[PDB]
Ligand binder design. Structure first.
Ligand SMILES: *[C@@H]1O[C@H](CO)[C@@H](O)[C@H](O)[C@H]1NC(C)=O
Ligand SMILES: *[C@@H]1O[C@H](CO)[C@@H](O)[C@H](O)[C@H]1NC(C)=O
Ligand SMILES: *[C@@H]1O[C@H](CO)[C@@H](O)[C@H](O)[C@H]1NC(C)=O
Ligand SMILES: *[C@@H]1O[C@H](CO)[C@@H](O)[C@H](O)[C@H]1NC(C)=O
Ligand SMILES: [Cl-]
Ligand SMILES: [Cl-]
Ligand SMILES: [Cl-]
Ligand SMILES: [Cl-]
Ligand SMILES: [Cl-]
Ligand SMILES: [Cl-]
Ligand SMILES: [Cl-]
Ligand SMILES: [Cl-]
Lengths: 278, 278
C-alpha cells in the first residue's frame, strides 16, 4: 500500500481557434493509480497501463473551451487533484510574437532501419520550443536510448526506423505567447519481406533454323528480384546492367536446339524456370 | 631513391587437378616497385598500383604445372627474386586429410547496408585454415576496420554492404596436406534508387446513377511505392493493409459526382493523379 504521486503535471495553455490543445498528466504508486480528466471535440488518450492520460481538445472553439480542467488519480489509499487553465484566441487576435509554423512535417515513407527526419521550422517571439506528438501522445526522445533525438532545428530525427515508429506525427511550438500545432503528417515504415516468384514463366518452343523467338521471364517480390539468363554454366546477361523484374531473351538466328534457364533472385531467395528450344 | 622490399612473399603450394592455385607477391619502396611473375590457364592480377601481383593457375593440370615460379621486382635502384613451388595431385591420389569443401558459398543478393555472410564449411586433417578470395584477389578483413570479419566457422561476414563488395567470392581451405578451392559464388549488392512514377493512370469517367465503375492506379519504382486512394482530405484505403504497386478503387452504387485522387508513395517521393467521376 502506498499513495500516488504525479511524475508529470499539466501546465496552463494558450491556444488558437481551429488548432489543438493537449494536457498531459501521469502518476505512479503501489498499487497503480488510474488518472481521469474532468463533448465530440474532447478526447482522452491513456498510457502506462492507464496511469497516464492526455486530454486533447480539437478543434479549439473560443470561448466555450476557455475553462479549468482537473486530473484526478484514484487509488486504494486516496486521491489527488491537479489543475490546468485553457485560453483560446482567434487568428485575428494573435499577438505579434505568437508561434507560427513556417515549414511543418509531411507524409513520409521510410524503409525499415533507415533514418526518418520529420522536419519542423517555427518562428515566434521569443523563439518557440519544439515538442513533438505521435498518435496524440507526446514523444520522449530521452526514452529512446539515443535512437531518437531532436535536432537544433526542431527536426525529429528517427534513426533505425522500426515498425512502431509508424504513426501520425505533429510538431508543436510553444512560447510565452501560446501554443501552435502543425498540420499532421503520417510516417509509414516499409518492410520488404516477400520472397521472389515468377509472374510470367518462359515458354518452350519448336522452331525452324533461324528461327527468331523472344523468350519472356517476369518475376516479382519485395524487394523486387533481378532477372538474368543462362544456358547451363554460361550466363548471358552482363552484370553491369542486369534487369530488375523483367528480362526478355531475344534470339535472332538459331541453328541447334538448346535449353535456356531464367534465374530470378533477391535477398530473400533464388528461383529458376527453364525454356527449351527444339 | 630506395631499393624495394617484399611486404608479402609467396608460399609453396600443393594443389588438386581441376582446382585452383594462387601465388601472392607484393613489395614497397621509393620509387614504387613493379612486380612480375615468371599459357591460357595462367593469369596475372595486379594490385596496389602494379606493386602487388597474383599468379592464378586454373584449372590445374598435373604434372605440367608442377614447377617453381619467381616473383621479380623492378626498380631504379635494383631488383630482387622470390621463389615458390607448385605441386598438383589428382582426386584419386589425395591424402586422407586433404581439405574438402563440405558447404561452399552460393550466388547471393544483398541490399545495400545489409549484412552478407558468405558461408564456408571445410574438413581436413589437420582442420584447414580458411582464407577468402574476391575477383581473383585475396580478402584482407583486417583492412576493413571492423566492417568485414571472418567468423570462427570460416564464414566471411560483410556488414554494411556497399557497391564495391559486389564480386566473385571463393573460399580456400589450406592445411599441411594442401589447398582446396570452392565453387565460386557471386555476391550482388542491390541499390534501390528509382523515384516512384505511374505506369497506369486512373481514367476519368461519366456515369448514370449507380453506376458501377472500378478505377485503376498502378505505380512503379525502386523501392516499389505504396498506392492509396483519397477523396480530398479523407483517405479511403486503410493503413493496416495498404497495397504496394497496384490499387483498384471499386465503386458500387454512385449518386453524386466526385473527384478521387490516387497517391503513390515511396521513400524517394510522393506522386498524385486524379480521376473525376461525373
Ligand atoms: C522480339 O522483340 C524485339 C524488340 O521488341 C523485336 O524487334 C523483334 O521483332 C521480336 N522478335 C520476335 C518476337 O520474334
Ligand atoms: C533439355 O533438358 C531436357 C529435360 O531434362 C532434356 O530432355 C533435353 O535433352 C535437354 N535438351 C538440350 C538441347 O539440352
Ligand atoms: C470491378 O472489379 C470487381 C472485382 O474483380 C468485379 O467483381 C466487378 O464486377 C468490377 N466492376 C466493374 C468493372 O464495374
Ligand atoms: C473536380 O476538379 C475539377 C478540376 O479542378 C473541377 O473543375 C470540378 O469542379 C471538380 N469536381 C468535383 C465534383 O469536385
Ligand atoms: Cl501539459
Ligand atoms: Cl527547439
Ligand atoms: Cl503546417
Ligand atoms: Cl515461383
Ligand atoms: Cl601465397
Ligand atoms: Cl578458420
Ligand atoms: Cl563447393
Ligand atoms: Cl509519373
Amino acid at each position: 500500500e502506498e499513495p500516488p504521486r504525479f511524475i508529470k503535471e499539466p501546465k496552463d495553455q494558450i491556444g488558437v481557434s481551429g488548432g489543438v490543445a493537449s494536457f498531459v498528466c501521469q502518476a505512479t504508486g503501489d498499487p497503480k493509480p488510474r488518472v481521469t480528466w474532468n463533448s465530440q471535440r474532447f478526447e482522452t488518450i491513456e498510457f502506462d497501463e492507464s496511469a497516464g492520460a492526455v486530454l486533447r481538445i480539437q478543434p479549439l472553439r473560443t470561448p466555450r473551451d476557455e475553462n479549468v480542467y482537473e486530473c484526478v488519480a484514484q487509488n486504494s489509499v486516496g486521491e489527488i487533484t491537479v489543475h490546468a487553465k485553457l485560453t483560446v484566441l482567434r487568428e485575428d487576435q494573435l499577438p505579434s510574437g505568437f508561434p507560427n509554423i513556417d515549414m511543418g512535417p509531411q507524409l513520409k515513407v521510410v524503409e525499415r532501419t533507415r533514418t526518418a527526419t520529420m522536419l519542423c521550422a517555427a518562428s515566434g517571439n521569443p523563439d518557440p520550443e519544439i515538442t513533438w506528438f505521435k498518435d496524440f501522445l507526446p514523444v520522449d526522445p530521452s526514452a529512446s536510448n539515443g535512437r531518437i533525438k531532436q535536432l537544433r532545428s526542431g527536426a525529429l530525427q528517427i534513426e533505425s526506423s522500426e515498425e512502431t515508429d509508424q504513426g501520425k506525427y505533429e510538431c508543436v511550438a510553444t512560447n510565452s505567447a501560446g501554443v501552435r500545432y502543425s498540420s499532421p503528417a503520417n510516417l509509414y515504415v516499409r518492410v520488404q519481406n516477400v520472397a521472389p516468384r515468377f509472374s510470367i514463366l518462359p515458354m518452350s518452343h519448336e522452331i525452324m533454323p533461324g528461327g527468331n523467338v523472344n523468350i519472356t521471364c517476369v518475376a516479382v517480390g519485395s524487394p523486387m528480384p533481378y532477372v538474368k539468363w543462362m544456358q547451363g554454366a554460361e550466363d548471358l546477361t552482363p552484370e553491369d546492367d542486369m534487369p530488375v523484374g523483367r528480362n526478355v531473351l531475344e534470339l535472332t538466328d538459331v541453328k541447334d536446339s538448346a535449353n535456356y534457364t531464367c534465374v530470378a533472385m533477391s535477398s530473400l531467395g533464388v528461383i529458376e524456370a527453364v525454356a527449351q528450344i527444339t
